[PDB]
Design a protein around this ligand. Structure first.
Ligand SMILES: CCCCCCCCCCCCCCCCCC(=O)OC[C@H](COP(=O)([O-])OCC(O)COP(=O)([O-])OC[C@@H](COC(=O)CCCCCCCCCCCCCCCCC)OC(=O)CCCCCCCCCCCCCCCCC)OC(=O)CCCCCCCCCCCCCCCCC
Ligand SMILES: CCCCCCCCCCCCCCCCCC(=O)OC[C@H](COP(=O)(O)OCCN)OC(=O)CCCCCCCCCCCCCCCCC
Ligand code: SF4
Ligand code: SF4
Lengths: 126, 191, 233, 242, 45, 182, 123
């Protein structure tokens, strides 16, 4: 299966490089489901990253399923026009697939030295 | 009223953000022969040329510099000068504030106790090749000694005529004192 | 704040120039705007997309020609741009012609702002009333002791800024200018990086010029109108 | 009938008269407290969301800073560029800073912007004269020139950079200027040698030496400790006395 | 030993390393004043 | 007309034409409104800046509560020494806010017991991931995320709701590829 | 995308001495092959062998450096200079900075023992 994120030709909306997306809502729904899939599968349940993106995708998907008008969906999803929302969806999904390989939920890999992060505030150095 | 997911009511797009559409050759409320005539007789071109011509008949802005100078203000900052009191004594006391605040470090001073027991200078230099003409030196002096004249006509053929010393500044202040008094009488209250 | 107050009889002359400036801007628009050759040299040239203009750090008219309404004067007002009306033009197509139209629109909106400020210049001081930061008047420095002390210190050692650091920015006409200052509790800065919009503009010049002929390269550098003393920092 | 010869002389028009000017006394930082509590919550979310990388975060007057390590630059930048709540797409600046007192003297600083949400954010790492930093040209193409600058100015090496070379300094310059060990005037100067007929580089000799005037620095502490503006939701609780 | 020689990558001359001496110190408490802020920092000149 | 023109010639402060030449100019002008641009000598820059009467009456301007001589202590209007501290929060100081709470929402034991509880976190006694997993729903959904469960967004200090102006108020007409935002 | 210039190498810090050995040798080879170009592009008043001698001297300068990171830094700086020279970015002065020796003998007294330095106050 494949999805159309961005038409680089066709009717121009007010942004350059971005053009009108035919049939956005199905693409948004498929991408949101794929993000939820990658998170439900590869990420721990108790990670804040997962819960945040899950509630975000679920709420945006509900706003996309209940509504039909794109202007309304834009006034509800407060993130640009719908053709920018699809790109936010794509970028979020690719971030999920990348973060499945990295392990942000894990504990700190490099612990800073005590000398690092001291800025002219210790009252006894100048 | 509304709950937002990674968004806001500000970042929600403007109501009319979606531009309508590009018009085509159809839906053109200007007949083909009209825009053809404007295409072949170069209308806007002739209009621009006429706007050019009207300037041909208008008053030129030019002034003849050596016989008519441009506007000059009391706040203007040109050549330097060291002033005197009406008594004939010099105002400098070697507080060396002009030497400290000067961004370019052009100034160079050396004082000592004068024979009459007073504080005065034996050396006061300015490298006008280091000067940026900022006026911080006429601002720091608490006696209004050093000033900046409206003079700008002091070009030279050599770079060593620009290393002004104390004598060259005291004479410059003896010369321009009347002009300095005008500028000071109309600049001091704001300064 | 400001060094010295306005001299008398300045708002009047500003109002005179302002009443006459719209005409001269219009005389410029007559030659340039609707002309064919100007369009041929500026229509579909230097065309840059929204996402590219953001990835490249571009700001100002280069960004407002892609369709993004960003103006720091509205999204983060600093001096009095929140207490005075004005509009921000925006354009599609990202070309040079749209940037030229934006620049002319900014001329006229700035004229609107000048008229408003001349109509409402409040009385009071033009500089902070804390003589530990701003030098006092001279009629006090020559009569009050604490004022002369403060004058001396500000014009020898200067004023001690608190430790910290900040990037603060503005809507400079070129773009989004900025300064990254660092402090160490002294009168001398520890670091000061000037972020220069012409820098990122010239850096994008390679992405922007690829595919275009030399006359178009000239027009591109002209859209950005880089001031190379800025570009070189 | 009317003309410029009969135009109103505004110079005589009556002008506003104000007896007493009233300017209330106000702190400029009380304006920021709610935004500051918000930034604290947002930083807390990000630290909970990427515990592997974020060492800490500071806040100061509507400015956020995230402290990380050189390994964590590409991942955190991906999060800050692609995540929905943090669409920090624009790269405003890159800057290095020299703190010789540290083991890792350098401190690279990324500034970021979100035109979407209208917000900025920072991101700090650390480096040395030999330990490089990952390059974010993979994401933000505008970082190319800024990283070339930081290299030429301070000597920091941005790994992965397609063409890292000097941009400001002279083509044969040997040194990194903004280091605190580098003298103001540099080590070299140029003159025209009539013999060789060439601009030639010679050791420095100045006709007026540099006078620092930083020896007049104040002996008294000028600005005492500030004032806490941490929101109480981020203050470590005091246990009840008993 | 194993203290890195950054002198090789500094781009600076070698005369600083071979002929020139530094001194590390704290500024003495001035007798003309009673303040002590200019101290507590280890200057290198 | 609009609040931004057009305006006639007899209100513009420029040197124009007089007599039959004005009739001819208004005939032969693309826009007779327009001016030559040369300023009117009697008015512009008169009296000269070095002869303004207003400089003798001038006095250094001030504001009332700062020029007040009696109840105007400096330590109340010292805004520099009241500067807000640069707060710093490492993972230690954040896990304590998680395992424990804050002065607004305490969850801490009283007495030296809770003191050493803080001490266990001041040192590496409990970690950030451990107390992220030991955090009940009311903790996360209410102190890390929102009550609704959604993450917070990049805050704006001074939000800007944009608006579009179209048609007659706009700087340019409809045909041109530029628009106007308020 | 902002593409790399002609002879640009991506900065890549090798983890071993055995690979950097090879990279340094390729750099030396390129300098030698390109030396005649360094003689044509810059109006040079001496030999191609003398350029190759100076190149060998500059590589013998850091022959005895065993810290790997410093070697990576040195190699990157050298590739920078090769890119600066082979593309005609440097002008004559910045290049003949590396050839002080070829220029005429600067005067007569060049002190090498103590007493002369003392008479010239250089000791
Ligand atoms: C051989 C070389 C001899 C050259 C010298 C010629 C001198 C001469 O003949 O004077 C004629 C003399 C020129 O007028 P003037 O005395 O110099 O005008 C002074 C007025 O104060 C002018 O008042 P003004 O400053 O407001 O300017 C009005 C101007 C305004 O001009 C316009 O706006 C018309 C725009 C150009 C139309 C082009 C149509 C061609 O119209 C003109 O001056 C005449 C332009 C023709 O009389 C004529 O008008 C004859 C016109 C032929
Ligand atoms: C006093 C002297 C005043 C004259 C000075 C003129 C200065 C030089 C003028 C420069 C020419 C303008 C130009 O830029 O030409 C290029 C322009 C390109 O347009 P194009 O590529 O064809 O795009 C088509 C979609 N619009 O295409 C054009 O604009 C060319 C327009 C035609 C050029 C003039 C033709 C004059 C001959 C008129 C013949 C009339 C008969 C033809 C039918 C006309 C019907 C009314
Ligand atoms: S005004 Fe000129 S002389 Fe005075 S401090 Fe500034 S640069 Fe120096
Ligand atoms: S500030 Fe004035 S009085 Fe003081 S040294 Fe300078 S010129 Fe002399």
């Amino acid at each position: 299966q494949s999805v159309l994120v961005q038409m680089r030709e066709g009717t121009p909306i007010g942004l350059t490089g971005i053009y009108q997306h035919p049939n956005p809502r199905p693409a948004l729904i498929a991408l949101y489901e794929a993000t939820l899939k990658e998170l439900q599968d590869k990420h721990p349940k108790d990670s804040v990253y997962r819960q945040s993106i899950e509630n975000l995708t679920a709420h945006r998907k509900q706003i996309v399923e209940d509504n039909e008008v794109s202007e309304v969906i834009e006034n509800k999803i407060g993130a640009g026009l719908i053709e920018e929302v699809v790109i936010q969806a794509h970028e979020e999904l690719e971030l999920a697939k990348k973060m499945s390989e990295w392990k942000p939920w894990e504990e700190l890999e490099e612990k800073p030295l005590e000398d690092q992060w001291v800025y002219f505030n210790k009252k006894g150095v100048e | 009223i509304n709950i937002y997911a990674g968004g806001s009511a500000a970042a929600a797009p403007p109501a009319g953000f979606r531009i309508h559409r590009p018009a085509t050759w159809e839906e053109s409320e200007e007949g083909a022969l009209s825009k053809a005539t404007k295409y072949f007789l170069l209308a806007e071109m002739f209009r621009g040329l006429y706007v050019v011509l009207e300037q041909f008949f208008r008053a030129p802005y030019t002034i003849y510099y050596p016989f008519e100078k441009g506007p000059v203000s009391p706040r203007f900052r040109g050549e330097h000068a060291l002033r005197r009191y009406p008594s004939g004594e010099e105002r400098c006391i070697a507080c060396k504030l002009c030497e400290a605040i000067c961004p370019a470090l052009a100034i160079t001073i050396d004082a000592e106790e004068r024979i009459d027991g007073s504080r005065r200078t034996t050396k006061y230099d300015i490298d006008m090749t280091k000067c940026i003409y900022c006026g911080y030196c006429q601002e720091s002096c608490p006696v209004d000694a050093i000033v900046e004249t409206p003079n700008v006509e002091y070009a030279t053929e050599t770079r060593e005529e620009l290393l002004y010393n104390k004598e060259k500044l005291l004479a410059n202040g003896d010369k321009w004192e009347l002009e300095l008094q005008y500028a000071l009488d109309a600049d001091a209250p704001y300064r | 704040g400001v060094s010295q107050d306005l001299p008398a009889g300045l708002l009047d002359d500003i109002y005179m120039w302002a009443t006459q400036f719209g005409d001269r801007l219009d005389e410029i628009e007559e030659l340039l705007t609707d002309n064919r050759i100007w369009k041929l040299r500026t229509v579909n040239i230097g065309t840059v997309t929204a996402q590219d203009a953001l990835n490249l750090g571009l700001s100002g008219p280069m960004l407002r020609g892609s369709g993004i309404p960003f103006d720091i004067r509205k999204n983060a007002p600093y001096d009095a741009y929140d207490k005075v009306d004005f509009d921000v033009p925006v354009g599609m197509n990202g070309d040079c012609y749209d940037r030229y139209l934006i620049r002319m629109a900014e001329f006229r909106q700035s004229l609107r702002i000048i008229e408003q400020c001349c109509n409402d210049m409040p009385a009071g001081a033009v500089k902070v009333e804390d003589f530990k930061i701003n030098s006092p008047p001279r009629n006090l420095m020559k009569e009050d002791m604490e004022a002369l002390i403060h004058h001396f210190l500000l014009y020898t050692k200067g004023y001690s800024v608190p430790p910290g650091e900040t990037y603060t920015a503005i809507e400079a006409p070129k773009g989004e200018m900025g300064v990254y200052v660092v402090s160490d509790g002294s009168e001398r800065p520890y670091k000061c990086k000037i972020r220069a919009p012409g820098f990122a503009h010239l850096g994008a010049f390679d992405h922007i010029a690829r595919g275009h002929f030399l006359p178009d390269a000239v027009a591109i550098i002209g859209t950005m109108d880089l001031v190379f003393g800025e570009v070189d920092r | 009938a009317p003309s410029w010869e009969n135009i109103k002389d505004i110079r005589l028009d009556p002008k506003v008269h104000v007896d007493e000017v009233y300017e209330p006394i106000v702190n400029p930082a009380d304006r920021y407290l709610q935004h500051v509590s918000d930034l604290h919550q947002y930083a807390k979310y990000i630290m909970a969301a990427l515990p592997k990388y974020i060492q800490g975060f500071s806040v100061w007057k509507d400015e956020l800073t995230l402290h990380v390590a050189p390994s964590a630059v590409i991942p955190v930048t991906t999060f800050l560029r692609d995540n929905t709540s943090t669409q920090y797409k624009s790269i405003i600046d890159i800057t290095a800073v020299d703190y010789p007192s540290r083991e890792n003297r350098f401190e690279v600083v990324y500034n970021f912007l979100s035109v979407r949400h209208n917000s900025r954010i920072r991101l700090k790492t650390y480096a040395t004269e030999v330990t490089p930093v990952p390059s974010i040209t993979c994401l933000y193409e505008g970082a190319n020139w800024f990283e070339r600058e930081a290299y030429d100015m301070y000597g920091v090496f941005f790994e992965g950079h397609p063409d890292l070379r000097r941009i400001m300094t002279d083509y044969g310059f040997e040194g990194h200027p903004l280091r605190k060990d580098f003298p103001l005037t540099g080590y070299t100067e140029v003159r025209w040698d009539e013999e060789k007929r060439r601009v030639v580089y010679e050791p420095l000799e100045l006709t007026q030496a540099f006078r620092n005037f930083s020896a007049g620095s104040t002996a008294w502490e000028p600005v005492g400790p500030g004032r806490d503006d941490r929101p109480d939701s981020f203050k470590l609780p005091t246990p009840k006395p008993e | 030993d194993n203290v890195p020689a950054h002198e090789i990558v500094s781009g600076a001359p070698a005369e600083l390393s071979r002929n020139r001496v530094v001194r590390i110190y704290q500024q003495a408490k001035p007798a003309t004043q009673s303040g002590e802020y200019g101290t507590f920092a280890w200057r290198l000149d | 007309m609009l609040p931004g023109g057009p305006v006639p010639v007899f209100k513009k402060y420029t040197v124009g034409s007089k007599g039959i030449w004005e009739k001819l100019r208004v005939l032969l002008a693309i826009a007779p409104n327009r001016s030559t641009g040369n300023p009117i000598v009697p008015l512009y820059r008169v009296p000269t800046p070095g002869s303004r009467p207003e400089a003798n009456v001038y006095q250094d301007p001030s504001s009332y509560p700062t020029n007040d001589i009696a109840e105007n202590p400096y330590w109340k209007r010292d805004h520099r020494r009241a500067y807000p501290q640069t707060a710093f929060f490492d993972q230690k100081t954040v896990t304590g806010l998680l395992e424990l709470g804050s002065e607004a929402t305490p969850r801490i034991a009283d007495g030296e017991a809770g003191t050493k509880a803080l001490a266990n976190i001041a040192n590496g006694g409990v970690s950030f991931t451990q107390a992220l997993g030991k955090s009940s729903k009311d903790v996360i959904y209410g102190e890390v995320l929102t009550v609704n469960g959604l993450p917070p967004v990049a805050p704006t200090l001074a939000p800007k709701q944009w608006k579009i102006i179209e048609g007659e108020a706009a700087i340019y007409p409809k045909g041109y590829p530029c628009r106007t935002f308020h | 995308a902002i593409i790399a210039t002609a002879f640009a190498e991506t900065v890549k810090f090798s983890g071993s001495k055995q690979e950097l050995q090879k990279r340094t040798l390729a750099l030396y080879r390129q300098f030698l092959r390109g030396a005649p170009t360094f003689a044509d592009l810059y109006e040079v008043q001496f030999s191609i062998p003398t350029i190759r001698t100076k190149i060998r001297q500059e590589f013998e300068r850091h022959r005895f450096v065993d810290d790997l990171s410093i070697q990576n830094v040195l190699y990157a700086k050298g590739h920078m200079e090769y890119q600066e020279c082979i593309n005609f970015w440097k002008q004559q002065a910045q290049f003949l900075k590396y050839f002080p020796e070829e220029d005429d003998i600067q005067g007569r007294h060049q002190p090498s023992n103590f007493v002369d330095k003392f008479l010239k106050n250089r000791a």
